[PDB]
Structure formats: C-alpha cells, structure tokens
Write a protein that binds this ligand. Sequence first.
Ligand SMILES: O=C(NC(=O)c1cc(F)c(F)cc1Cl)Nc1cc(F)ccc1N1CCC(C(=O)O)CC1
Ligand SMILES: O=C(NC(=O)c1cc(F)c(F)cc1Cl)Nc1cc(F)ccc1N1CCC(C(=O)O)CC1
Ligand SMILES: *C(=O)c1c(COP(=O)(O)O)cnc(C)c1O
Ligand SMILES: *C(=O)c1c(COP(=O)(O)O)cnc(C)c1O
Ligand SMILES: CC(=O)N[C@@H]1O[C@H](CO)[C@@H](O)[C@H](O)[C@H]1O
Ligand SMILES: CC(=O)N[C@@H]1O[C@H](CO)[C@@H](O)[C@H](O)[C@H]1O
Lengths: 790, 790
Amino acid sequence: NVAELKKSFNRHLHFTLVKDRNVATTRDYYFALAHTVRDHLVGRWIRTQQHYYDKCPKRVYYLSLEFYMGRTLQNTMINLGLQNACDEAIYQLGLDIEELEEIEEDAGLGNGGLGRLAACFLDSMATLGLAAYGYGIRYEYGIFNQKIRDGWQVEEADDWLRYGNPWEKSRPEFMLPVHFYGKVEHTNTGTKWIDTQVVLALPYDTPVPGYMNNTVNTMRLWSARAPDYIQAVLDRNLAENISRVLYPNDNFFEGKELRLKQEYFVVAATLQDIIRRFKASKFVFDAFPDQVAIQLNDTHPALAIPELMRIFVDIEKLPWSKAWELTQKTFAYTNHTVLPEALERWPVDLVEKLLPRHLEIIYEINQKHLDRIVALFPKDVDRLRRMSLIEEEGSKRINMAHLCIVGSHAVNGVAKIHSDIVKTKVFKDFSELEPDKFQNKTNGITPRRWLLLCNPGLAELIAEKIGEDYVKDLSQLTKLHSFLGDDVFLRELAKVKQENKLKFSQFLETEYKVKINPSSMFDVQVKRIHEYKRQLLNCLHVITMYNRIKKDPKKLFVPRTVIIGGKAAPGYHMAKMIIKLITSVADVVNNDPMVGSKLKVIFLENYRVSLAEKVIPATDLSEQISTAGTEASGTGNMKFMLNGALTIGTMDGANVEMAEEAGEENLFIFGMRIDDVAALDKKGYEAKEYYEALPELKLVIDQIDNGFFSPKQPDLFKDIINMLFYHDRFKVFADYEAYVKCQDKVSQLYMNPKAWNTMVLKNIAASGKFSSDRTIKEYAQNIWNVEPSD
Amino acid sequence: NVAELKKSFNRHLHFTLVKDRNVATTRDYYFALAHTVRDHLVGRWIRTQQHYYDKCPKRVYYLSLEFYMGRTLQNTMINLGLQNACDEAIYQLGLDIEELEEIEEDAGLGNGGLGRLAACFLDSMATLGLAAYGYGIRYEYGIFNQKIRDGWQVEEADDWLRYGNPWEKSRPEFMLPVHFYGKVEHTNTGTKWIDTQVVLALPYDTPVPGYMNNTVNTMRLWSARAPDYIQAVLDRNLAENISRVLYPNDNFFEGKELRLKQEYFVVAATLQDIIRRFKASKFVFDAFPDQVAIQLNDTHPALAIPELMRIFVDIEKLPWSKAWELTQKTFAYTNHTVLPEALERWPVDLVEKLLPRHLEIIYEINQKHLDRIVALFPKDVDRLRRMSLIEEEGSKRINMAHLCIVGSHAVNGVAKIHSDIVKTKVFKDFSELEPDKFQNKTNGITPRRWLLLCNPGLAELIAEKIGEDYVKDLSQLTKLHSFLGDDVFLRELAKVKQENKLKFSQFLETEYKVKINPSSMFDVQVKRIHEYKRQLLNCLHVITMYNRIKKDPKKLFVPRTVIIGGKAAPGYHMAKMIIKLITSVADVVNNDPMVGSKLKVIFLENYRVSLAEKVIPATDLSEQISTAGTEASGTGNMKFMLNGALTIGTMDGANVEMAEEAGEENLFIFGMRIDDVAALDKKGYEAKEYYEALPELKLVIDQIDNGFFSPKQPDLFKDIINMLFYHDRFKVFADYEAYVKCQDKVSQLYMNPKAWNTMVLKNIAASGKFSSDRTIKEYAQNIWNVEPSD
Ligand SMILES: O=C(NC(=O)c1cc(F)c(F)cc1Cl)Nc1cc(F)ccc1N1CCC(C(=O)O)CC1
Ligand SMILES: O=C(NC(=O)c1cc(F)c(F)cc1Cl)Nc1cc(F)ccc1N1CCC(C(=O)O)CC1
Ligand SMILES: *C(=O)c1c(COP(=O)(O)O)cnc(C)c1O
Ligand SMILES: *C(=O)c1c(COP(=O)(O)O)cnc(C)c1O
Ligand SMILES: CC(=O)N[C@@H]1O[C@H](CO)[C@@H](O)[C@H](O)[C@H]1O
Ligand SMILES: CC(=O)N[C@@H]1O[C@H](CO)[C@@H](O)[C@H](O)[C@H]1O
C-alpha cells in the first residue's frame, strides 16, 4: 500500500542517501525509490532461491556474453504489480515519477537482438516459474553511447556504474578463481594444467522478477580481479580488464585475445559456481544431466564444453566416455548466426597460448569425432575435413559451432526458416548423422517490457476489452479478431497510436532541428547498422521520395516521417558511411521547404533498449527489409507488430512465420525469396543492370556519387558506390524495385484510416506466438526438459 | 535501545544483504551491524553539515595525502555511545561481536605516524565541536599488506574496496574536473590554461563522529574518473590510475609523475570544492580567510599555494597582491620532516610538462620573494640562492618546503625540540625575517581510539576511580596521581596490563609457531622499519641478551618478549634486510632449547592501526629509539605511555616532552642528546672504535657477519655490517652501550611489581598533555582562529 511505500521511500533518502527533501538531486530520489522497489522483492528472491535450493528442480542456466537488460526500475514495479502504488507514493510526495525513471542507465550489456533475447528469456523463465538463472559478464562499460556529430557516429564510454547500481548485490562468499596461460603437464596422477595466471571472478546478483507469480530468479554477472611496486600494483588493471568493456560486434567475429579471455572467464566462473551448487544440493556426477541444462547462447560460450570435460577429466578424475556423455547431455546450442563473418573461428596458437589444456581437449574431442566418421563413411574423405573441429589451412583455426554440435544434445535455430537452413543446409553433414538433435525455436519478446510497460495505451485498451490474462497467456490476442467490426474500437486503437506518436514527436522536436508532422506516417527502421539489414536500401527509397517532390510537389504526397537509427560498430567503416549518408540525406530533406512538412528524416542517435521501448509504440511502418536469408529471426520485427506498426519486409527471418500467423497480405512482403536469391547467385550479381534499367534509381545513385548530399566534399560516398556496383552481397538494387513498388502499396493504404487500422487489428491479434513465454515452453519441453509452476 | 538495535540488525541483513540467517556469512553480519550503527549517526551528520552551511562559521580544512584511519565500525559505536547497547544486541542474536569487527578492513590510507596524525585530528576536531573537514585521496589500495615469506617482507595489494565500504557515501553532485598538461596562453582577458587533459574527481564522504557531542564532521576523499575502440576504453584506466595506490615512501622522496599527479589531484579538487562552497555560503573574496583555513599536512599538498593563486588571479580575476595576501592567510603549513631525503624536491621539467601555469606562478611568487631579500640584504648574494624557491644547482629543483613557508602565515613543527630546530637551524633564513610565523604544536593521539577503544580495561578502571571527565579533558589524568601509594589500585592496574598481555599472548600463539610466556616483559618496537629508528639497535640488544643466556644459562635472566613490527618500504633494501636479520635471529632464539621460556622474539606481520590497537594495550616497554634529532615527535611513543608502558628511549622527538610531564626518573632515557651527537660529528663517528672497545658487541656483530644466524646464507648480511661500519648516519654502535646499560634498569625495575607499577601509574597520570584534543586547541587558537562549540 501507498502509505507504507511513501514511508519506505523516505527512510532510504534519509538513511541510504543522507539527504533532506531540501537538497536531494533528481538522482537521489531515484535511488531512494529503487531501493524501495528492491526492498519488496528481497522477500520473494530469498524464498524463490531458497525454494529451488530446498527442492532441487532441474535448474536452467542461460550462459551468455550478452544480457541487453535495459532499465530495471519501472519494469520491476510493473512485474511486481507494485507500479501503480509506487506511482501514487511518488505523486503524493510531489515528485515527477517519469523524471526519476529516466535517471536510470541502460544496462547496455549486449549488442542487438541476441542480447535482448537473453534478456527477454530471463523475464519469461521467471514469469513461467522456471528455476532458471542468468550467467554473464558484469561489464563496466556496456555498448557505447552514440553521438551524431557532423553526421558521423561518435562513441563514448557507457560509464553506467560510475555512480552505482541498486539492482545488483555482490556475492563475495561465491567468488572464484579462473586460470589463464601456463603449460600443460603430463604426469602419473593424471594431467595437470600447471604454472598458471589467476583472475578472481567476483559474482554479482540481479533479480529477474517473474510477472506476478512470486518467482524471483537470479541473474549472475561476474567481475574480474587479481589475488617496482607501484607499477606492479597498477598492473592489476590488466586482470580487471577482462570485465571492463563488452565487445561491440553485432554479427562479426573479431578474434581478439581479450575477447577470447572474456569467453573462458564467464565460462570457468559459471561452471565452477554451477558445479558447487549441484554438490551443495541433495546429490558422483551421474545425476548431473538431470540436474543441469546449460543453454549455450550461440558459439560465444563454446568454451564451456571443453571446460566441463576439464573439470570432469582433470578435476573429478571421471573416466572420459562417461564424462563426454554428460557434457553432451547437459549442454545445448542455440545457433544465432549465419553470415560467415559472424562465426567465431579461433586461431589455435591463441588457444595454445591462452588455454593450452582446452586445446588438448578440443584436439581430443575432435579426434574421436573423426574416428566415428571414418567408421561411418570409410571411403569419404572430404566429409572428414568438412566435420573436423580444425580448419587446417594457412593459419589453423577452431570451428566453435562444430564444437558446439559435437558437444551438445540439441542444436537449434532462432526461427523456422533459419533453422530449416541450419539443419538441411549449413550443417547438412551433422544433421544427417543424427537429425533428432537439430530443432527450431522461433524467437519472442516479453509482452511485459514491450507491451504493459512501453505502450501502456495499447496494453490498457486491450485490457478494457478482453481481460488481462493476455499478459500472462498472450496468445489471447486472437480475441481481438472479434473486434474487427467495431467502429468505436478501430478509432479507439488509432487514438492510442496518435497519443504515442504525439508524445514521441515532442521528444523528436526538443532533441533535433525538425518540425515533426504529428499526423504523418511513421516509418521506423531501428537496429544495428549493417549492409545485410539494408538501411541503405531504405535510404535510397528515402532519396527516391525526395525525387518525386521536386519534379512535382503539387501532387498529393502521403506525408511520412522516416526515422532510421542504430549503433554501427566502431570497426565497421561501411556502416558508419551509411549513417553519414542517412544524416546527409536527412539534411537536404529537412531544410528544403520545397518539400517542407511532406517528408522528414530523423536519424536516432544512441539507440538502446530504453530508447526502443519508446519509439516502437509510436510506429506505423516497421522496416524489416533485410536480404533473403540474412535475418535469422529478429526480435525487433516482432515488437512492431505487437505495437500497432505494419511491417514492410522480406520472406526472411521470423517475418516469414509472422505472416504465417497474421496472413501474407496483412504484412507487406516484397523482394526475392531465399530461392530467388539463390537463383541470382547462380547467375551472379550484375549491379549495373538495374542502374541502366531504372530511370528512377539511377538518379538516386547519381546524387550520391556526384555530390548532391555531399557537395562541400563531392566524392566521400565513392566507397559506398564501389560496394553497391561491384560487391553487394545483399543486393541493394536487386530488391529496390520490388521495395519501392511495395512502398506505394503501404502509402495508398495509409490514406484509408479505417482500413490500415483493420490491417493493424489483425497484426496485434495474431502476434500471440511471439510472446517469449511460448519460446521458453518450447525450449522447456524439448531441450532443457523442465516443468513450469509458481 | 537494546531492542531496536536488534531489529535493525535483523532488518538490514535481510533487505540490504538479502540474506536469511540460515546462510548469512560472517561478513554479512558485519555489514548489517555497520549499517545499523551508521543509521544512528546520519541525523547528526546532516544537522552538523547544515549547521555549518547555515550559520557559516569559519571552516578548518586538513589537506592530506594520508589518513591512516583504521576500521570505523568499532570507533563509531563508541562515540555514538552505542558500543554497549550493540554488544548486548549482537550477544543476544547469538553472534560474537569481536568477530564481526575483524571482518572490517583497515582503511589504512597512510604510510605511518603522519597518516595517523590526520586521522587522530579528525576525531578531535569533531569532539572539540569544530567546523572541520578532512580532504584526501580515496586510494583504491592503501598501504600494502605484508606477509613474511622465508623471513622476508612480501608486499601485497591492500585491496580494501574489493568487498565495498559501508562508511563512505559517494557525492556524484560535488564532482569536479581536474586538469593536466596542455599549454599556457596569455590573453586580453588574463591568462589561459588550454589544450589540457582532464581527469574527474568524485568525492566520497565519510562520517567523522564526535565523542558524544552531536557533531559528526566530514572527511571527503576523492577518486579519479575519465570524462582501436576497445583499447581507448581500457586506456581510461590511466586516468583512474591517479587515485589508484598510496605511495609507500615513509620519510622518503622518490619523485614520480604519478605522485605529482596525486598531489595536484587531491589539491585541485580540494580547493575548488572549498571555493564553490564559500561562494555558496552567506559570503567579494575578502571574507575568504576569515571563513576558510587550510592546514597543509607536510609539503605534499604544496601545489595548493599556486593552485589557489591560479583560481584566484585567473578564474576570479583578482589583482595579484590581493590573491597573495589571502593565499598566506588561508594556508598554514605543518613541517613533519627532518631527513634531507624526505623533503619534496620537484624537478622543474616535470612541473613544466604537467602543470605549466603552476610553474609560471611558482616562478612569479619566487621573483617577488627574492625582491624582499635583495631589498633587505643587497649584499647577501648567497642568501638569495639559499632562500629561493628554486634550487638552480644542476637540474633545477623546486624546494617545496620554502613554497609553504613563503605562502603560509604559520609554519609549525611537531615537538618542542622539533619546531625549535626548524625555527632556528633548518629555516633560520626565513624566521629571522618573520620570527612570529614559526610556532609549535606538540603532537597528540586520540584517547577514544587509544583508550575507550583499544583498551576498555584502563578506560574503565580510570573511569571508575576518577570518573569519565577525562576522555574529553585528558589533562584530568593527573587526578590519578592521588593513587600512587594505593596498593590495590596499583595491583588492579598490573592486572589490566596482564589481561591485555594474556589476550594478546593468545593472539601471538594462534598467529605464530611460538609459545608465549604469560609473564614475560612485553618489549615492543612497532613503527615503519627505518635505519634511523634503529630497529637494528633493538635488534642488537636481542642478541646481546641471548648471549647472556649462553655465557651462563643458570643466571637469572628476566624473561622478556621482544616484539618488533613495522613495514619496510619496497625501495628500502636496507629496511627489508634488517627485517630478514630480525627473523633470522628470531628463528634461532625461539629454537635454541637452552633458552625456552626465557626469551621469545616475534616480528609483527602487517603492522597496521588495528593491529596497533592490539599490541599497544599489552606492552610493558615501548622502544622509542631513533637516533637523537631524527624524530620530529613520534605519536607511537605517546600511546604506550597512556597504556601503562614505560618508554626506553633517546632524548629525541616528543619523548623529551614526555619527560617534561612525567619526569626523567619515570622514563628510561638513554644515549646521546642532539648536542652529544653533534659533537661526535664534529669529532667524526669512526665506527669500528666500539667493536674493539666492547667485548659483547663484538660477538653480536661477528655473529651477524660470520653467519651464526645465517648458516645457509652466511654473507647474506654483509650489506649491513658494511653500512654499520661505513655508512651509519644514525650511529647504531654509538648509542649501543648506553641502551644496553639502560636495558638493565628496565630488567631490574620490572622485578619490582610495586616500583614498576608505581612508575607505570605516574606515566598514565602525566600522559594528560599528549591529547590530540589539546593539539587541536593549540592549532584552533593560534593558527586557524576558530572556536569550539556544540
Ligand atoms: O541533507 C544534507 N546532506 C548532506 O549534506 C550530506 C549528504 C551526503 F550524501 C553525505 F554523505 C553526507 C552529508 Cl552530511 N545536507 C543539507 C541539508 C539541508 F537541508 C540543507 C543543507 C545541506 N547541506 C549541508 C552542507 C552541504 C555542503 O556544504 O556541501 C550542502 C548541503
Ligand atoms: O537467504 C538467502 N539469500 C540468498 O540466496 C540471496 C542472497 C543475495 F545476496 C541476493 F542478492 C539474493 C538472494 Cl536470493 N538464501 C538462502 C536462504 C535460506 F534460508 C536457505 C538457503 C539459501 N540459499 C539460496 C540458494 C543459494 C544457492 O543456490 O547457492 C544458497 C543459499
Ligand atoms: C531488439 O531486439 C533490439 C535490437 C535488435 O532488433 P532486431 O532484431 O534487429 O529487429 C537492437 N537494439 C535494441 C535496443 C533492441 O531492443
Ligand atoms: C601510531 O602512532 C602509529 C604509528 C606511529 O608510529 P611512530 O610514531 O613513528 O612510532 C605508525 N603506524 C601505525 C599503524 C600507528 O598506529
Ligand atoms: C549474432 C547475432 O547477434 N545474431 C542475431 O540473433 C538474434 C536473436 O536470435 C536474431 O534475431 C538476429 O537475426 C541475429 O542476427
Ligand atoms: C615524513 C613523515 O611521515 N614524518 C613523520 O611525521 C610524524 C607526524 O607528526 C612525526 O611524528 C614523525 O617524527 C615523522 O616520522
């Protein structure tokens, strides 16, 4: 109740924050309130953990390098059904609640979708009452802050721990050592990884609060530290440099020794802690597969596999065959990646230098892996070097996905189509050998963070009509199909959008130099910037539109506001270049009042979960315009649907099964299918053809190359054109023409408000499958093999 | 009260530590207790600080690179009068209080006694109700941890923030920018320090309670913060590398750029924080000195004199003369040093690169300074080069002691004989010009930490016989003179010592492979290992003793336990050596079966404030045996006196002033006075003329040299024998015999329970003056010009 909440808020401001109402900052109130919000959870965290300890269900362990968690404060109140009363306590206390919430930093401990997937899974696993966890690295700087400075991506540190974190609590008694380097020794009492360097891993808890169920899971994030003088003391910095900055590589393997360290680290820490827990409970190690599932979130924690064997073989002195069994049983692999540049393939010297014992264990696991394929395909020899864990060209390297397949019991992909590819195509060699290991698990997105919270309009609207069990069991949204008729309703829906759009448009005017049209069509494309996701393909169409206003501004133009945004990797020079252009484009279209209020181009600086939380609800057109067989699933494409945005997108990623739920027409699919792509790959890309045979496109590409958007520096964008004309693996022009045509389709619909809305009500009803609650069930019944409750 | 304490202890363990009692760690227990004790101190911390802010009384600023603060939990309980009520509360929750208390890490951000002076005064300014602060660097690593591996001091990272510190509270809103390097432009709007490099200073406040008085002052410590990509992030360390480790140079100037940075870092932050606050008060800047006082704690914070002067002329745009009149008005200097290697001589090159504006001002200040003397002494050519702020000889070196004097309105030494020599001999040139500037403030120790805390026993018995007036006014301990022939009070004193002895005897028996005689005379030299302090002298007597056992193991040898402890500085090979010797001797001693329970010798591992609080209370003899006129005062000595230990020691430092109060009969003074040494330097201290002249000494030296204590490494010690014979500034031989003769009187008087005890009582009675509460009164009156209140 409000009153005792009012009290709790002040006892902290006094005792924890040492402040009078007279002198408290905006920050100080947040902490006072956050502590109040942590307080009423501690109860159900101890019990929940206590319970999973007392009773031993099979504990889940989601081991990931990335947990894109965003903001905890509001989310926890919502999930703990304490928001309303908290909002009320802060009101009576004449404080601005929004203000306090914005003080809180993004736990930007992840790059993109996989990061948010690791996050959303946490939320559900709790809301499902599953005894799950969360194993990860407590990075001191997350994903970088993105500043638009002279139309160029500028990065800054994500110094989110500068002032602190009320959500985390250190667990010193559970601190563990981790070893790096040294030599392997071969002796009589078995084999010893002698003479090694030690980094302490200090584990920090953060509560994953179930959605109104009393379950409160742990999320364990680890941090580093060490066991003339001055310099030697200063040199401890290198060990505490393993947990410092998270790597900013969305779909790109950059094999840096520090990263390699980061990997092992979060893996040795985890498996040690996990093993301790098993033995700590009411249980040799025969029982271990039944007591622990470890989901390897992608190849990233591949190193866990050889580590588990290490801890068995070298430490439990358990006999190999038996230990190699349980590792397979325990572990599983969700494969997130396709693009070859996103596959972790580690130089061996590196591994020989850093983790020599794990190289003998990878060289060993590989050995047998081939001893079987030679007793299953004796004549065949190309299959051998096609399945080995070692790629024996120039610099020899380990395939980490190969190790995860030979090391797991269930490999999966992240959406039907993608998984279909992983199984039958990408790994046709392993799958044939035992197909029952490869399965699919289509991604999701907790309707808590992404509905209840961020669009409380929609969440409430739907709540007044059809109960609120849909927040627990989301595939209830179908019950809005009965509202397809209702006049009042469609117009009621459109209101919620308009509200969202207006409040977002204010933000957009008070941040940038742009008159935002509050009744225009919101075109949004937000994610990591990448040639594969085609923000460029978008960009051209944005130019294309400008080109339709000049020739004729008097034609009734469907007024739209383009909003592209996303963090380009530092290393990714090409993506940064796409941004500059996008911003350059933005500069021509914003100021040129020949067009004026008809079309505006906003690039969203520093896009992060809390910013996604805001823009998504105020969107009309989701842009999911990747290339045939690039997007593995997307988690973002899902939200937009669940938020009243129409999706423009390719028959790629979960966009495919998104149509399979709403209907192929209710989504704007265009461009070439994975088959059409493979057809043109046979014929091979010939960029010029469309440049010749497209009276419109060519102009766009002349304006880029001549210097319409960069005059004061005409060439600049040459780099781009060289990729577009000779090296475009994602075929920007090839699907330009379908896209532009499929863009008019959307424009012509948006004229009719009563129709768009109807096509929207269809999308929002048929977004039930994409509640991450479902994914988890699937994962539960087939991979981890556990049972939900409360 | 008893009950609420219990509830908040249980309440805190529950909500802050998120533990159930079932699994709560020893450490969780401390933290809950810590937090509970803090809560009854917050309300006063806020009032105290608002009071100052409101009424605006003149504010004292102790500017120091060192606060040897120790633990806070026990002290804080004491001053809030809560120890008793918390001893009960913990007792009832079935936990052992004593145990929790040792979980706390020593906030040892100090090298030695100078470090402890800064801490002691914080306690006293708080009690004397004064509006004072303490500004220091919040070193991530304090003075290192010390282990003994194969009889050697091993350094270890004092990692005191690993687990976190409940007694600081960050101040994210009082954060300040600091500047380094760049260049100096002189412009139409005064001069400009541009192109500079930026570190941030984030302040962390700590309560400094008063002893039962409603004033809880502040101590404000600062840590450093920043304002390939992966590599750029890691490089931020370099910045935070300025608050990283405390320099372990006890009485030594190694001049490292990092330290120069530490020194500007603390000072720059300190000054700006003082100013901003003054500008925030009721108060152009002509009020300033009447509102602010900065004591300069040795030269270390010297960069302030120009730093202010920068802030004064360049920011506030004040006319030089005005800025200078005020600089000296607000800065008061404490000289702590005697040795020529512990003066801070900064090489201009360095001070050019890192702080080029401050070098300008250091020059200008010095130009006007030579102006004065040219004016008075137009023929004294050598005086100008002597009294300058620059030492032109070779690489130009800034004498920083001059910097303080010239820019302070008061320059003090720490003892009668100290300030004395500093007035007439070490600084004659300046005091002849301004005799009045130079004064004395005899050092003192805080009797809350060094009686109420580390010694309930005395504190009680005293507080039973002559009440508790004596804590706040220690000069009451003369009221104890009335009991000199009180046989029972005498016998109840020896018992307090006994228990302290026995408890501490248990400390020793559990920490070492050595049996303690419960009735041995506790002989304790605890103090940073230094040639000048002559631990080596002590050492030699330990040998001289052992031989008096060999020469006839049937003679009555008075059983004594020699306990020597201190930390050799990393650079100090000669200290680290002497340590190996003591240990070497120790082994032999505690191992020759022919002694047994006649003489035990232990080195003190990791001697620190907390561990001082143990040994000190259980001592009979305190070695205060530096070579005459090498100790400015000492503070160690002072305790032992006030814990019923008789001193044996040179007429050096404050040991003289201890004789003044108690009378020379009641100390064991020995050796040569400053003048006796002087003559032996006018004579020349030819070293070997003793090893011939004294039979016993010969044997001791021949044994250290020929290998008695070093069979395996026989020449190991040569480095010392050589130093003794050929490079002994501190004349270990010269005062040997005197010491050894003096030693007999100790051994003899000890055999007289009544005579000894009577003496011990005279000491504790006369100990009155050595209150750091009296030292404050003197500082407050004749330097800071401020009044105590409540
Ligand atoms: O509530 C506080 N709290 C603290 O000052 C305080 C905060 C901490 F985070 C801490 F760790 C210790 C203190 Cl003491 N102060 C306060 C309350 C008022 F109602 C009016 C004035 C003040 N002043 C006190 C002096 C301060 C200064 O000079 O910097 C400014 C604020
Ligand atoms: O009281 C707690 N408190 C926490 O576990 C706890 C501590 C935190 F610092 C935190 F931030 C969150 C929790 Cl939930 N636990 C507890 C209480 C009991 F009465 C009995 C057992 C336990 N268990 C829970 C499971 C642990 C494990 O899985 O290793 C072991 C301790
Ligand atoms: C959502 O997953 C999301 C992403 C990735 O979105 P896509 O899967 O590419 O659609 C990136 N950044 C944030 C903040 C998200 O919430
Ligand atoms: C106490 O004063 C103390 C000292 C002082 O040593 P000396 O006066 O130099 O003998 C040094 N170190 C610690 C930890 C102390 O508590
Ligand atoms: C390496 C990586 O970040 N992979 C990403 O994984 C997420 C979550 O499965 C997918 O939505 C996305 O298509 C894919 O690019
Ligand atoms: C350089 C330094 O730390 N000097 C020390 O200052 C303390 C504190 O006053 C004196 O007791 C002592 O004589 C001296 O060793």
